[PDB]
Amino acid sequence: MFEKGYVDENYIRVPKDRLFSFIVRVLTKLGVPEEDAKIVADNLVMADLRGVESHGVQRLKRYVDGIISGGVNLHPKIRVIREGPSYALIDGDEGLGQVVGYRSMKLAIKKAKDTGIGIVIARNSNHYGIAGYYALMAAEEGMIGISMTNSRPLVAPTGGIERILGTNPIALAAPTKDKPFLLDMATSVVPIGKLEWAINREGNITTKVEEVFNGGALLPLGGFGELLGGHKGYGLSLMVDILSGILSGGTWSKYVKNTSEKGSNVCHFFMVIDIEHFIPLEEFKEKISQMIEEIKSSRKHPEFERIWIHGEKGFLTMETRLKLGIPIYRKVLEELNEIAKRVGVEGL
Amino acid sequence: MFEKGYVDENYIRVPKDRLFSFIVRVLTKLGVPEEDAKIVADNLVMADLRGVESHGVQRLKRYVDGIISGGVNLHPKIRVIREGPSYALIDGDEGLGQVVGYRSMKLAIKKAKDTGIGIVIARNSNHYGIAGYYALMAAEEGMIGISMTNSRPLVAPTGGIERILGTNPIALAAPTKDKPFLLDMATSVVPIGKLEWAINREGNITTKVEEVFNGGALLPLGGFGELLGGHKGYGLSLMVDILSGILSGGTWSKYVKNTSEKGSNVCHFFMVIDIEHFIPLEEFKEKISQMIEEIKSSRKHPEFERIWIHGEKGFLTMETRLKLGIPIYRKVLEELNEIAKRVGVEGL
Ligand SMILES: NC(=O)C1=CN([C@@H]2O[C@H](COP(=O)(O)OP(=O)(O)OC[C@H]3O[C@@H](n4cnc5c(N)ncnc54)[C@H](OP(=O)(O)O)[C@@H]3O)[C@@H](O)[C@H]2O)C=CC1
Ligand SMILES: NC(=O)C1=CN([C@@H]2O[C@H](COP(=O)(O)OP(=O)(O)OC[C@H]3O[C@@H](n4cnc5c(N)ncnc54)[C@H](OP(=O)(O)O)[C@@H]3O)[C@@H](O)[C@H]2O)C=CC1
Structure with missing residues (x-):
């Protein structure tokens, strides 16, 4: 169907629900309350679904590093x-x-x-x-x-x-x-x-x-x-x-x-x-x-x-990737599995 | 001093206070309450002062025609x-x-x-x-x-x-x-x-x-x-x-x-x-x-x-034209005097 970006061989389809649970696994393993982890995942997954690679899971390493360095408060008041x-x-x-x-x-x-x-x-x-x-x-x-x-x-x-x-x-x-x-x-x-x-x-x-x-x-x-x-x-x-x-x-x-x-x-x-x-x-x-x-x-x-x-392209791109799966670049997928290994959780 | 647009011989300096009173004369002659006429003049004059010719007095003919045609309500509720x-x-x-x-x-x-x-x-x-x-x-x-x-x-x-x-x-x-x-x-x-x-x-x-x-x-x-x-x-x-x-x-x-x-x-x-x-x-x-x-x-x-x-260029342009006068194109100035003749008031 329609898709905002260009996906080729260098990409791997990942079930939306799979990418979501992955993010939640990593975040909760780092001490992020489950409900807050679900909000972050929802936001990052939406970006990937709408075709905004720059703001999707590709940025999980950014939040992970911030959590580990104390740059991100786990229990903000x-x-x-x-x-x-x-x-x-x-x-x-x-x-x-x-x-x-x-x-x-x-x-x-x-x-x-x-x-x-x-x-x-x-x-x-x-x-x-x-x-x-x-x-x-x-x-x-x-x-x-x-x-x-x-x-x-x-x-x-x-x-x-x-x-x-x-x-x-x-x-x-x-x-x-x-x-x-x-x-x-x-x-x-x-x-x-x-x-x-x-x-x-x-x-x-x-x-x-x-x-x-x-x-x-x-x-x-x-x-x-x-x-x-x-x-x-x-x-x-x-x-x-x-x-x-x-x-x-x-x-x-x-x-x-x-x-x-x-x-x-x-x-x-x-x-x-x-x-x-x-x-x-x-x-x-x-x-x-x-x-x-x-x-x-x-x-x-x-x-x-x-x-x-x-918003139209994005919604169509989403619709597609929901039944066709979310395309994740090769190098990014490797990056996510390395994060999974580092924190100690099942990868993708 | 500094001025946003390019003014040459085809322009005539008009005392800010003079352009203002002119607009008010025309509008009140057409039945616009004096206080409302002053608001319109203030708005149009500010545009001319800030160097926005497109939205200054050059548009007085637009409002005049609207008033005469009933397209503009003189006493809006x-x-x-x-x-x-x-x-x-x-x-x-x-x-x-x-x-x-x-x-x-x-x-x-x-x-x-x-x-x-x-x-x-x-x-x-x-x-x-x-x-x-x-x-x-x-x-x-x-x-x-x-x-x-x-x-x-x-x-x-x-x-x-x-x-x-x-x-x-x-x-x-x-x-x-x-x-x-x-x-x-x-x-x-x-x-x-x-x-x-x-x-x-x-x-x-x-x-x-x-x-x-x-x-x-x-x-x-x-x-x-x-x-x-x-x-x-x-x-x-x-x-x-x-x-x-x-x-x-x-x-x-x-x-x-x-x-x-x-x-x-x-x-x-x-x-x-x-x-x-x-x-x-x-x-x-x-x-x-x-x-x-x-x-x-x-x-x-x-x-x-x-x-x-x-906003800087505009304020500087204004500052200049306030003591140097507001430059009004030649053809536009002719247009304004024709409006003055039509409605029956002193022009510029
Ligand atoms: N957190 C941060 O600090 C920052 C976050 N961002 C985010 O990154 C993303 C990057 O956005 P950006 O590259 O500027 O935007 P895009 O150029 O991709 O999109 C601009 C907007 O125009 C729409 N659009 C795209 N093509 C057309 C078209 N042909 N006709 C009509 N509308 C169209 C899009 O809808 P559609 O959804 O359908 O593509 C979108 O709403 C955004 O989601 C932004 O919020 C950006 C900078 C900083
Ligand atoms: N009523 C209507 O239906 C409409 C009204 N308009 C009006 O017409 C006018 C035309 O505006 P437009 O041509 O788009 O705007 P301009 O491109 O002249 O100005 C855009 C803005 O950028 C500023 N600016 C200009 N140069 C620089 C610079 N080098 N660095 C930083 N800022 C700068 C201006 O400030 P500065 O004031 O200093 O020049 C201004 O605020 C506006 O006043 C607008 O409100 C436009 C369309 C419709």
Whole structure:
């Protein structure tokens, strides 16, 4: 069926349920409470299912190292710093990002349900995987969900060459008559996790392919200059840091550390709008689905086969891999079995 | 001094205060209440001062025609449809966009002040000028302001060629130790109002220069395809319509009519976050200004002179034109005097 990425011989199909239980085995063996392990697995598996290799199991080694080094708190006391009927400022106590984000989004949904609006911001957290995972939580509840997060410095501001801004993604999910609308994008042309594109910044600023890791930097949405809107992708990145890092009293991208480090201080932004408080949900669903249908049905470009709606490719890719299995690269699969050997659990 | 656009002989310096009083004369002569006329003038003049010609006085003829044709309600009964301590759904009753947006943002600021958060959405409104104008209102109050609006169909979705999406801008303003941070951008590479760029969509999809007006279409931030993130600018445009048009029970871009038409149904989104409810405002200002200083001071690209912060060029351009005067194109100035003659008031 349809699948977002290109899978060949260098890939091995792994039963979704198998990959999931594996992750849970490793995490619980390291002391992660079973329920928290299930949240992390759910988040990482969703990424693999939707075709986001960069944020799937390939990143399990990152969390494992963070747990072993004490850079990730196994029993975080996620505390509410400031709060109101429609908002809350949370301190993640260095817990897994998935756990901090899961609890933060659950609280935002609760507040929206009760007041119409829910805005929860968190600081002192860790990498939380795909932003769409949290936005979707609200959509599955019949509400609009928005999630953002800052990250390690990897992008250069317009007119500069240093890695100072994060890939800071933005995600919005809304319910429809069918599957939720789901926008989930890094504010840079591409995520660093992708490079296994367009973010061409070399030594002084060019491109290449491997000069990125060697003191290189990614480009913000819009591109290299100001001509094609590069300064806009740069602004969007700042919006994320202002709403996440600055407003929470946490920190911005430049100072976000790797997961293995204590005090990574990754910050997140969660916002939920209870559609029902505004207009009937069924009316909302009818109208948005009609918009989606009309957009898809609009005059296709000769070169193009189809006009997709955000989240569509991912849901189709998921559907496929659920009965066909999740394709995991060769070297990554080896990596996961080595992790299994190290911690002492059955591998894949 | 510094100025965002290029001004030559084809431009005439007009005292800011002079341009302002002119607009107010024309509008009040057409029956617009004096206070509402001052709001419109303030919004249009700010655009000219910040160097946004496309949304300044050059658009006075648009509002004039709408007023004369009944497409703009002179005495709108701006009504609250749904409301809560932290939100409100407003129906603009076809009033001037500036009036609807001004009252909507004032309400959002009030709710944020009292609860920490304020989200006001409006439907049945009209073109409201620059989005940054409303976001700035909140920043000048010591809060974070976010504003969005949908518009007439001018952009083609990724993989298509029809004008179906709006240029739907996004604006965020935050207070700093100095002048407010101000991001204000269309989600398309450029606004249609600019074409007097990068939005290359011709007859079937290419570029050119004049083929845009002739059945052409603008390109979404990211560009023509999917390779450089074109689908992201496309998603951002939808986010705006979902938060503005769909959620409000109004309508999305494809169905937004020109100002002169009754029922233009332009919709807006306003969001205010009272910083103080989260962290001390003075701490917020210190931290964001430190981030801005560090970004500007980062390693400059050889080709580039300076790294700007969003809103900086505009504020500098304004500063200049306030003591040097606002430069108005030749043909536009003629247009304004003709309007003055038609309505019967002193021109420029
Ligand atoms: N935790 C962190 O610090 C970071 C996490 N990330 C995450 O990594 C992932 C990488 O995202 P990124 O590469 O920027 O995004 P992509 O370019 O893959 O996708 C951008 C969005 O556009 C949609 N889309 C893709 N193609 C089309 C099309 N032809 N027409 C319409 N919509 C389309 C996608 O939906 P679909 O789902 O269908 O593909 C998606 O919502 C994200 O999930 C992001 O949240 C990124 C940076 C940092
Ligand atoms: N009412 C409507 O229906 C619509 C209104 N609009 C409005 O029209 C205007 C057109 O905006 P648009 O052309 O997209 O935006 P620009 O590309 O001019 O500006 C994008 C943003 O980036 C900032 N910026 C510009 N150059 C740099 C740089 N080198 N480094 C860092 N930041 C930079 C700007 O600040 P600065 O202020 O300093 O220039 C601005 O906030 C906006 O004000 C928008 O709100 C657009 C579409 C529709």
